[PDB]
Amino acid sequence: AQRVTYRRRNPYNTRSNKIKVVKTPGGKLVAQHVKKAASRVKCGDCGSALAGISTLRPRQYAQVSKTHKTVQRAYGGSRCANCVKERIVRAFLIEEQKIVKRVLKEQQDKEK
Amino acid sequence: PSQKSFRTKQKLAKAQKQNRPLPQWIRLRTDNKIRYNAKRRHWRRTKLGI
Amino acid sequence: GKGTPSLGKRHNKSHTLCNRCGRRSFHVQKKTCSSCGYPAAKMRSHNWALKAKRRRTTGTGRMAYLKHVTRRFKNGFQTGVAKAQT
Amino acid sequence: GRVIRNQRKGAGSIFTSHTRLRKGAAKLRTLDYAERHGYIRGVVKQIIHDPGRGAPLAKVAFRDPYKYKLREETFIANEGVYTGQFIYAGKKASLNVGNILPLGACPEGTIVSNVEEKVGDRGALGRTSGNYVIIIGHNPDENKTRVKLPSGAKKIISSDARGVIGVVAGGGRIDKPLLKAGRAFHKYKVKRNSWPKTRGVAMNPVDHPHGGGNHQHIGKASTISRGAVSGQKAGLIAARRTGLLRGTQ
RNA sequence: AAACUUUCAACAACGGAUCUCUUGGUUCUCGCAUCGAUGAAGAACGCAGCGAAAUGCGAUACGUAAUAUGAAUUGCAGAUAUUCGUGAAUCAUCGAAUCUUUGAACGCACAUUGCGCCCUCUGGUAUUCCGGAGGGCAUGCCUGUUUGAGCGUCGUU
RNA sequence: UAACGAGAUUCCCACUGUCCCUAUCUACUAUCUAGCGAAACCACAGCCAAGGGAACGGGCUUGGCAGAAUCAGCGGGGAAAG
RNA sequence: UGCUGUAAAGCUGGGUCGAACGGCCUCUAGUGCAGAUCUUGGUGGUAGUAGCAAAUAUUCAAAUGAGAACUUUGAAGACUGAAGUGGGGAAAGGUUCCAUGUCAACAGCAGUUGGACAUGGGUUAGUCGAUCCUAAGAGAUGGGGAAGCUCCGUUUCAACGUGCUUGAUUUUUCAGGCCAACCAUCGAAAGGGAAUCCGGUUAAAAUUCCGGAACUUGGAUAUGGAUUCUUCACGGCAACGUAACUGAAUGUGGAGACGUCGGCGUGAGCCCUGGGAGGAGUUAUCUUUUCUUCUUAACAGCUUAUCACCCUGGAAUUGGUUUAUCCGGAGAUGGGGUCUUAUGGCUGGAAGAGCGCGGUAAUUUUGCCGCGUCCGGUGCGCUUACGACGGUCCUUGAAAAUCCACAGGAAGGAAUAGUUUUCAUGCCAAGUCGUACUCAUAACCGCAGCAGGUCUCCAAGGUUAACAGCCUCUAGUUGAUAGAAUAAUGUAGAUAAGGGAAGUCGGCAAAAUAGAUCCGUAACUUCGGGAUAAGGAUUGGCUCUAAGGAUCGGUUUAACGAUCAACUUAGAACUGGUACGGACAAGGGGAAUCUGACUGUCUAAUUAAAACAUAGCAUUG
RNA sequence: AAUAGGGUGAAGCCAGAGGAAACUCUGGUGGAGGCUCGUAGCGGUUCUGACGUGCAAAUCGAUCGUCGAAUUUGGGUAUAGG
RNA sequence: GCGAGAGACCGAUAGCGAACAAGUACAGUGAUGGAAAGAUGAAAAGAACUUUGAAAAGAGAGUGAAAAAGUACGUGAAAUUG
Ligand SMILES: [Mg+2]
Ligand SMILES: [Mg+2]
Ligand SMILES: [Mg+2]
Ligand SMILES: [Mg+2]
Ligand SMILES: [Mg+2]
Ligand SMILES: [Mg+2]
Ligand SMILES: [Mg+2]
Ligand SMILES: [Mg+2]
Ligand SMILES: [Mg+2]
Ligand SMILES: [Mg+2]
Ligand SMILES: [Mg+2]
Ligand SMILES: [Mg+2]
Ligand SMILES: [Mg+2]
Ligand SMILES: [Mg+2]
Ligand SMILES: [Mg+2]
Ligand SMILES: [Mg+2]
Ligand SMILES: [Mg+2]
Ligand SMILES: [Mg+2]
Ligand SMILES: [Mg+2]
Ligand SMILES: [Mg+2]
Ligand SMILES: [Mg+2]
Ligand SMILES: [Mg+2]
Ligand SMILES: [Mg+2]
Ligand SMILES: [Mg+2]
Ligand SMILES: [Mg+2]
Ligand SMILES: [Mg+2]
Ligand SMILES: [Mg+2]
Ligand SMILES: [Mg+2]
Ligand SMILES: [Mg+2]
Ligand SMILES: [Mg+2]
Ligand SMILES: [Mg+2]
Ligand SMILES: [Mg+2]
Ligand SMILES: [Mg+2]
Ligand SMILES: [Mg+2]
Ligand SMILES: [Mg+2]
Ligand SMILES: [Mg+2]
Ligand SMILES: [Mg+2]
Ligand SMILES: [Mg+2]
Ligand SMILES: [Mg+2]
Ligand SMILES: [Mg+2]
Ligand SMILES: [Mg+2]
Ligand SMILES: [Mg+2]
Ligand SMILES: [Mg+2]
Ligand SMILES: [Mg+2]
Ligand SMILES: [Mg+2]
Ligand SMILES: [Mg+2]
Ligand SMILES: [Mg+2]
Ligand SMILES: [Mg+2]
Ligand SMILES: [Mg+2]
Ligand SMILES: [Mg+2]
Ligand SMILES: [Mg+2]
Ligand SMILES: [Mg+2]
Ligand SMILES: [Mg+2]
Ligand SMILES: [Mg+2]
Ligand SMILES: [Mg+2]
Ligand SMILES: [Mg+2]
Ligand SMILES: [Mg+2]
Ligand SMILES: [Mg+2]
Ligand SMILES: [Mg+2]
Ligand SMILES: [Mg+2]
Ligand SMILES: [Mg+2]
Ligand SMILES: [Mg+2]
Ligand SMILES: [Mg+2]
Ligand SMILES: [Mg+2]
Ligand SMILES: [Mg+2]
Ligand SMILES: [Mg+2]
Ligand SMILES: [Mg+2]
Ligand SMILES: [Mg+2]
Ligand SMILES: [Mg+2]
Ligand SMILES: [Mg+2]
Ligand SMILES: [Mg+2]
Ligand SMILES: [Mg+2]
Ligand SMILES: [Mg+2]
Ligand SMILES: [Mg+2]
Ligand SMILES: [Mg+2]
Ligand SMILES: [Mg+2]
Ligand SMILES: [Mg+2]
Ligand SMILES: [Mg+2]
Ligand SMILES: [Mg+2]
Ligand SMILES: [Mg+2]
Ligand SMILES: [Mg+2]
Ligand SMILES: [Mg+2]
Ligand SMILES: [Mg+2]
Ligand SMILES: [Mg+2]
Ligand SMILES: [Mg+2]
Ligand SMILES: [Mg+2]
Ligand SMILES: [Mg+2]
Ligand SMILES: [Mg+2]
Ligand SMILES: [Mg+2]
Ligand SMILES: [Mg+2]
Ligand SMILES: [Mg+2]
Ligand SMILES: [Mg+2]
Ligand SMILES: [Mg+2]
Ligand SMILES: [Mg+2]
Ligand SMILES: [Mg+2]
Ligand SMILES: [Mg+2]
Ligand SMILES: [Mg+2]
Ligand SMILES: [Mg+2]
Ligand SMILES: [Mg+2]
Ligand SMILES: [Mg+2]
Ligand SMILES: [Mg+2]
Ligand SMILES: [Mg+2]
Ligand SMILES: [Mg+2]
Ligand SMILES: [Mg+2]
Ligand SMILES: [Mg+2]
Ligand SMILES: [Mg+2]
Ligand SMILES: [Mg+2]
Ligand SMILES: [Mg+2]
Ligand SMILES: [Mg+2]
Ligand SMILES: [Mg+2]
Ligand SMILES: [Mg+2]
Ligand SMILES: [Mg+2]
Ligand SMILES: [Mg+2]
Ligand SMILES: [Mg+2]
Ligand SMILES: [Mg+2]
Ligand SMILES: [Mg+2]
Ligand SMILES: [Mg+2]
Ligand SMILES: [Mg+2]
Ligand SMILES: [Mg+2]
Ligand SMILES: [Mg+2]
Ligand SMILES: [Mg+2]
Ligand SMILES: [Mg+2]
Ligand SMILES: [Mg+2]
Ligand SMILES: [Mg+2]
Ligand SMILES: [Mg+2]
Ligand SMILES: [Mg+2]
Ligand SMILES: [Mg+2]
Ligand SMILES: [Mg+2]
Ligand SMILES: [Mg+2]
Ligand SMILES: [Mg+2]
Ligand SMILES: [Mg+2]
Ligand SMILES: [Mg+2]
Ligand SMILES: [Mg+2]
Ligand SMILES: [Mg+2]
Ligand SMILES: [Mg+2]
Ligand SMILES: [Mg+2]
Ligand SMILES: [Mg+2]
Ligand SMILES: [Mg+2]
Ligand SMILES: [Mg+2]
Ligand SMILES: [Mg+2]
Ligand SMILES: [Mg+2]
Ligand SMILES: [Mg+2]
Ligand SMILES: [Mg+2]
Ligand SMILES: [Mg+2]
Ligand SMILES: [Mg+2]
Ligand SMILES: [Mg+2]
Ligand SMILES: [Mg+2]
Ligand SMILES: [Mg+2]
Ligand SMILES: [Mg+2]
Ligand SMILES: [Mg+2]
Ligand SMILES: [Mg+2]
Ligand SMILES: [Mg+2]
Ligand SMILES: [Mg+2]
Ligand SMILES: [Mg+2]
Ligand SMILES: [Mg+2]
Ligand SMILES: [Mg+2]
Ligand SMILES: [Mg+2]
Ligand SMILES: [Mg+2]
Ligand SMILES: [Mg+2]
Ligand SMILES: [Mg+2]
Ligand SMILES: [Mg+2]
Ligand SMILES: [Mg+2]
Ligand SMILES: [Mg+2]
Ligand SMILES: [Mg+2]
Ligand SMILES: [Mg+2]
Ligand SMILES: [Mg+2]
Ligand SMILES: [Mg+2]
Ligand SMILES: [Mg+2]
Ligand SMILES: [Mg+2]
Ligand SMILES: [Mg+2]
Ligand SMILES: [Mg+2]
Ligand SMILES: [Mg+2]
Ligand SMILES: [Mg+2]
Ligand SMILES: [Mg+2]
Ligand SMILES: [Mg+2]
Ligand SMILES: [Mg+2]
Ligand SMILES: [Mg+2]
Ligand SMILES: [Mg+2]
Ligand SMILES: [Mg+2]
Ligand SMILES: [Mg+2]
Ligand SMILES: [Mg+2]
Ligand SMILES: [Mg+2]
Ligand SMILES: [Mg+2]
Ligand SMILES: [Mg+2]
Ligand SMILES: [Mg+2]
Ligand SMILES: [Mg+2]
Ligand SMILES: [Mg+2]
Ligand SMILES: [Mg+2]
Ligand SMILES: [Mg+2]
Ligand SMILES: [Mg+2]
Ligand SMILES: [Mg+2]
Ligand SMILES: [Mg+2]
Ligand SMILES: [Mg+2]
Ligand SMILES: [Mg+2]
Ligand SMILES: [Mg+2]
Ligand SMILES: [Mg+2]
Ligand SMILES: [Mg+2]
Ligand SMILES: [Mg+2]
Ligand SMILES: [Zn+2]
Ligand SMILES: [Zn+2]
Secondary structure (H helix, E strand, O other): OOOOOOOOOOOOOOOOOOEEEEEOOOOOEEEEEOOOOOOOOEOOOOOOEOOOOOOOOHHHHOOOOHHHOOOOOOOOOOOOHHHHHHHHHHHHHHHHHHHHHHHHHHHOOOOO | OOOOOHHHHHHHHHHHHOOOOOOHHHHHOOOOOOOOOOOOOOOOOOOOOO | OOOHHHHOOOOOOOEEOOOOOOOOOEEOOOOEEOOOOOOOOOOOOOOOOHHHHHHOOOOOOOOOOHHHHHHHHHOOOOOOOOOOOO | OOOOHHHHHHHOOOOOOOOOOOOOOOOOOOOOHHHHHOOEEEEEEEEEOOOOOOOOEEEEEEEOOOOOOEEEEEEEOEOOOOOOOEEEEOOOOOOOOOOEEEHHHOOOOOEEEOEOOOOOOOOOEOOOOOOOEEEEEEEOOOOEEEEEOOOOOEEEEEOOOEEEEOOEOOOOHHHOOOOOHHHHHHHHOOOOOOOOOOOHHHOOOOOOOOOOOOOOOOOOOOEEOOOOOOOOOOOEEOOOOOOOOOOOO
16 A cells, blocks of 8 residues: 655644545545644533534634624524523513512611 | 755855865966865765854 | 763754854853853953963954054044145 | 752752643732622632642632723632632621631631631632631730631631631542552642652762761751751751650640 | 895885975064944955955955056956056055944844834835835933923912 | 562472583684785793792703794793783 | 094095085083883884674676676566665755766775766745744843842833824824733744645756646725615524624633543545456466556535434333433423534536557657546454543643634614625735755764664555564665685584483573463462462364344234345364474463562663662651 | 553443342443553663674673553753862 | 064974964864974976876886986985885
């Protein structure tokens, strides 16, 4: 079987010097240098991988359209659906209870 | 190495030019005492200084 | 194996060319010249090494400016140009 | 003779602490208006391992009272503190695990950790895993409080000094044998270069006051005066007593 | 008796003593006072019709100007070089210039010919981006100029 | 003191040229040739016995003797060299 | 050649030579050599002696040449045997690279040859690295020490922006609006990081040149599309989808970006193999045979996935499920969906390229013509990438540059027209330095072409547990002075009757054992071990036998049919000079004493141990 | 950045058996360990082998220790002569 | 340092380390260390030409006052050698 060599001056098997083995139209077997695999965008609240967002190396996000990088919702590309659902319910219930804690501290300012 | 600096590569160019034999028309000058270039350098024998 | 086998592991230059004196005495990690003391303002020189002063002193280079001070002084530091005689 | 291993540590060439992996300095908040007059509420975001520390650290996010910004503090985690817990800090904070209170607001017998030696130094005493400070009593006229430190010493501190309610998490660590030299190597790999130790009696007289002899022996008393000089203080320095400790102290 | 070994003589070798030289050294005496931010000493790299070194010089590069002198230079070549003359050669002399990258070294940096910003002009349809040409931007301190700061402080509403 | 040990020690089984007691075989040397071609060392040198002697001589004294030029080995001596 | 003098010495004949020198009275001194393991230079004996013996190995012929064991070419015989004697690189070297010429010196023989000598030629980048970021660290500034060279300090007891953003203004003035926690700088050719591939091409360069096909950043900028009269889009219950589809200050997140292993799955490349279309080899005999070509880059579109998530629903007769144990009223099974695009497929790139054949043009730069280049299968395979998992820690396994999204709602926005360069297309530019060659039994360091040392990538077939050993394909070498003999003594390797440690300080050295399957396995023990304890049997070849699956097909006798497919295990017969782990590979075992618990560490270059360390224990501050 | 191929078989998990209970036993599965044989690697035990004017101012051969961690190692960086 | 004049000084192993392309060649990572090396002839007139040889060279010949001066260069000792 044909054996290959690196295509750059780096002779070491580092994380940024990873290669794939590819067969060329010339029937040869040469090394093709691969870029590091991209990591998935993750939720800032729960840490899970966000759905609907492309997995790219960070600079490649600048040259892609916005629909690839977001989801049509509040906190679209930042928080997950369940974390947004919990934010909405928590905001509504706590602010509703804020009214309850206020009116009670006015009923006791005329009887106590 | 293949990867060398400009400062290094410029010194290696001068070392080649200083390694020439004596031009033969110099021995014909009147009262000439130089018979040969006394500052020859072989790569394997004497090392430079880079 | 402290001799010949250990002498095979010499491929990391401690010194490189100095910008002031060009001598290969510039300690790479120390960023100092062991010969002329660069980048210190003063030149490295010692009275216990008088032969080292001989090697680098006035007259060992070109003296591209001190060459002519004697000849300009001898004429009283003329200003102007020489006048052709009639 | 030669410079002994004691004296080479002060130069701190190979004896500085290995701090690449450390997760920040563990401190209380800077004493500000909110803590001096009322209380401020923060939320625990993370509880993380700090290399070189037996105690876990907690990252707690507070709001900035004066500008729109979040401030992340590194507290020493008390046992029972959880992620998402509300931490209350100030004079008016309630007696709940994880809250930061002045010493005068805590009754006698209150178990507290990360206590301030001086007002506003953000925690000095009782910071390691399993340790805590017991509040012994109060002197309200002089605004002072007596506490008992992990060493068993009683100390008098300003009643305005702050502390965190509870015991430092991670206790009981010493109960387990290390079992291996490699375990101690990995333990000190993220602390500092202090392990392993060569016995001074096994070296030569140049290296140590204990070196030399046709048998390994100290030759003179290993209890050294407090007024001895550097290069001499090797052994039991200012030893009040020696031998097996029998009975109570 | 040969050969061999040894001794001697002649010639030839090996080697460079001896003799004789000497643009060098060494020492004494006499006389003089002149480095550098107007960028020194030193370093690197280059420069000749044909040059590697030494010497000289700096992209005007074994030199340009000027003065003196008065026909060369020379190893070869070669004038669109010169001879009763603004005229050959000359570190003879020297007062005008040129003086690369540097170096106390001065935009920042330098094991990189790495990276800025300002002014004027200019090219690419450009105050903003890219290119080019020229001129600038170090630190401490002094005098002065301008712009400021302080319930330190004076007058007045 | 289980386990561990290129740690020190004694014995047993197996095993064998360690031995009785040595023999045979292979390659490379050594050997001869062409070419090439060092080094240590060197007061002078190089046969013995006795004597005396700085009390263990190559030289001295008295004897034995003694015939050119040489080759491979060898390790008694040169109180060999370092 | 002699003479004189006791002598130190003086004089003289002959030869050589070529430019200075002497006698006498005095002055002066760096003034006389056999030594000093003297100094420097030169030269011997030794001596044509020791020797030029590791890395399996050469031979015939032709050519060239004055000259050939050694150069070239051809034929053969061999070796390295993918953990290479192969193909590249980092450090280091610096022209050793390539062509021509060439043998005075060097290549410890030789030389027509060379990494030698001489003359020339040769290294082409927006995409490969530098440059940019920060790491440990280095180190200016305000300052504080020190007589001082300098030391300290890195945001430090500092009034620290050569600030920006707009509307502009063409008034080259401004009006202001926001901010200034942190912020000199250097520091990685292995960390982070914008972007390039294929075919061809040179004597020597190529991800750099040629041809074609792409991509990123910065800048400029028009058209189409998109959007608005409900101004800053629609659809979907939802996960979310899209060619687009406002968004200041300020804030929050994500990517960058992270340990080590275990089994499993998938992919890629390699390995194996069937049909068909070609070429070469063997063919006394056999062999529908053995070997070989049948390939497809970056990039664009569509499609494609474990995990995760959404809708439905309400579960014990608990169910689902991995090789490995977890999940489910905090909503399982079931049904239906959403996402990441890693990876594969189709298509474009792209057959026009390359490859394999056949026919030709011709001293001929270089070709021209025709045909084919297709369809599969297989797997506890190897390597590698990824994935979902599981284990592990008194160990929890960088930073920064940089890029994006979101929150927020400042500000500006339409109807006869307004906005936007995150949708498509179009225009310009990408500077500087390195780039040849060696990477080692000859290009580095060891004085050298030194059996030493020196970081890393790729990795075929057979046997096998194996990337071991042995043989082979590709590739590369056939290099190491040679010739003739074969005494002693050697060095390396073999064998030996009978005895079997009697040798020796001592079993030193050697031998014996050895793979695999089955049986069997003691004291003691910290119950984990001891243990391969000890001690036995078998093993070849051939012909069989048995067992162990995949995918499909329908009232649950599918308990049956069809097709396909891998090497494992066990048993039997026969067979042979009783052989068979047949080469290779490969434990000797047991009973005790001293000692250190163990793994680990040191005297590089005479000591590896009982010495050091260690966990544990105790003491001190 | 690097580290063939085997052996042993720790927790956890599945199934069955016995028992009144407390619990115990068996067959699998699993893949732990500064575990083990043993390459590369790292080291350097013995022959007190070779050599000892060597290939070498420390090498060569066989044999050997360890070989998944207190492992090996490149580069950068820090520590400087009482 | 600059510019001069001198000496009962040394005469190429002396005199400065250096009379010469001397702080040169070369060593060492580095600080540093650091040589050897003058002489044909008045003038190259530096041996045309012929011949043997593959060549270097040799033999004739030529130049020169001398080749008993051939860049291995005046003179040319000793060790050592034919
Ligand atoms: Mg390459
Ligand atoms: Mg990630
Ligand atoms: Mg968060
Ligand atoms: Mg989080
Ligand atoms: Mg989307
Ligand atoms: Mg998408
Ligand atoms: Mg190069
Ligand atoms: Mg060398
Ligand atoms: Mg040097
Ligand atoms: Mg050396
Ligand atoms: Mg090293
Ligand atoms: Mg260093
Ligand atoms: Mg140096
Ligand atoms: Mg100068
Ligand atoms: Mg003393
Ligand atoms: Mg503190
Ligand atoms: Mg240590
Ligand atoms: Mg100790
Ligand atoms: Mg201790
Ligand atoms: Mg000791
Ligand atoms: Mg004492
Ligand atoms: Mg002492
Ligand atoms: Mg002692
Ligand atoms: Mg003791
Ligand atoms: Mg003791
Ligand atoms: Mg005692
Ligand atoms: Mg005779
Ligand atoms: Mg003089
Ligand atoms: Mg320079
Ligand atoms: Mg005139
Ligand atoms: Mg100029
Ligand atoms: Mg100059
Ligand atoms: Mg530079
Ligand atoms: Mg520069
Ligand atoms: Mg820079
Ligand atoms: Mg100034
Ligand atoms: Mg033992
Ligand atoms: Mg041992
Ligand atoms: Mg005993
Ligand atoms: Mg005993
Ligand atoms: Mg024998
Ligand atoms: Mg044999
Ligand atoms: Mg012999
Ligand atoms: Mg011979
Ligand atoms: Mg002798
Ligand atoms: Mg006698
Ligand atoms: Mg005698
Ligand atoms: Mg004698
Ligand atoms: Mg006598
Ligand atoms: Mg006699
Ligand atoms: Mg006799
Ligand atoms: Mg003897
Ligand atoms: Mg001798
Ligand atoms: Mg002796
Ligand atoms: Mg004369
Ligand atoms: Mg004298
Ligand atoms: Mg003498
Ligand atoms: Mg002598
Ligand atoms: Mg001598
Ligand atoms: Mg000799
Ligand atoms: Mg011989
Ligand atoms: Mg030999
Ligand atoms: Mg061989
Ligand atoms: Mg010839
Ligand atoms: Mg040969
Ligand atoms: Mg040969
Ligand atoms: Mg041949
Ligand atoms: Mg083979
Ligand atoms: Mg192998
Ligand atoms: Mg290789
Ligand atoms: Mg390299
Ligand atoms: Mg050349
Ligand atoms: Mg070549
Ligand atoms: Mg050639
Ligand atoms: Mg030779
Ligand atoms: Mg050459
Ligand atoms: Mg570029
Ligand atoms: Mg790049
Ligand atoms: Mg560069
Ligand atoms: Mg740049
Ligand atoms: Mg750039
Ligand atoms: Mg960047
Ligand atoms: Mg830093
Ligand atoms: Mg400093
Ligand atoms: Mg301060
Ligand atoms: Mg103005
Ligand atoms: Mg930088
Ligand atoms: Mg980098
Ligand atoms: Mg890099
Ligand atoms: Mg990188
Ligand atoms: Mg082509
Ligand atoms: Mg083409
Ligand atoms: Mg073409
Ligand atoms: Mg090439
Ligand atoms: Mg653009
Ligand atoms: Mg739309
Ligand atoms: Mg914003
Ligand atoms: Mg992140
Ligand atoms: Mg990283
Ligand atoms: Mg990793
Ligand atoms: Mg993990
Ligand atoms: Mg894995
Ligand atoms: Mg596969
Ligand atoms: Mg076909
Ligand atoms: Mg056949
Ligand atoms: Mg690509
Ligand atoms: Mg049911
Ligand atoms: Mg499994
Ligand atoms: Mg056909
Ligand atoms: Mg056709
Ligand atoms: Mg691999
Ligand atoms: Mg993985
Ligand atoms: Mg994964
Ligand atoms: Mg938004
Ligand atoms: Mg907000
Ligand atoms: Mg919004
Ligand atoms: Mg740029
Ligand atoms: Mg290359
Ligand atoms: Mg290599
Ligand atoms: Mg290589
Ligand atoms: Mg070698
Ligand atoms: Mg080698
Ligand atoms: Mg080579
Ligand atoms: Mg050596
Ligand atoms: Mg050396
Ligand atoms: Mg490595
Ligand atoms: Mg194998
Ligand atoms: Mg392999
Ligand atoms: Mg072999
Ligand atoms: Mg051989
Ligand atoms: Mg022979
Ligand atoms: Mg023999
Ligand atoms: Mg033997
Ligand atoms: Mg035999
Ligand atoms: Mg036999
Ligand atoms: Mg036999
Ligand atoms: Mg026998
Ligand atoms: Mg018999
Ligand atoms: Mg027996
Ligand atoms: Mg027996
Ligand atoms: Mg015995
Ligand atoms: Mg015995
Ligand atoms: Mg005996
Ligand atoms: Mg005995
Ligand atoms: Mg005995
Ligand atoms: Mg033995
Ligand atoms: Mg046998
Ligand atoms: Mg057994
Ligand atoms: Mg046993
Ligand atoms: Mg059988
Ligand atoms: Mg074997
Ligand atoms: Mg044995
Ligand atoms: Mg031990
Ligand atoms: Mg182990
Ligand atoms: Mg050990
Ligand atoms: Mg060590
Ligand atoms: Mg040793
Ligand atoms: Mg040893
Ligand atoms: Mg040992
Ligand atoms: Mg104990
Ligand atoms: Mg205590
Ligand atoms: Mg293997
Ligand atoms: Mg293993
Ligand atoms: Mg064992
Ligand atoms: Mg390996
Ligand atoms: Mg080894
Ligand atoms: Mg042996
Ligand atoms: Mg030996
Ligand atoms: Mg010998
Ligand atoms: Mg053997
Ligand atoms: Mg072994
Ligand atoms: Mg081994
Ligand atoms: Mg082991
Ligand atoms: Mg591990
Ligand atoms: Mg000292
Ligand atoms: Mg000193
Ligand atoms: Mg000192
Ligand atoms: Mg001391
Ligand atoms: Mg002293
Ligand atoms: Mg003068
Ligand atoms: Mg003077
Ligand atoms: Mg005068
Ligand atoms: Mg001299
Ligand atoms: Mg002369
Ligand atoms: Mg002479
Ligand atoms: Mg003359
Ligand atoms: Mg004359
Ligand atoms: Mg002639
Ligand atoms: Mg002739
Ligand atoms: Mg003649
Ligand atoms: Mg004549
Ligand atoms: Mg004459
Ligand atoms: Mg003569
Ligand atoms: Mg003469
Ligand atoms: Mg001569
Ligand atoms: Mg003469
Ligand atoms: Mg002569
Ligand atoms: Mg003589
Ligand atoms: Zn979430
Ligand atoms: Zn310097």
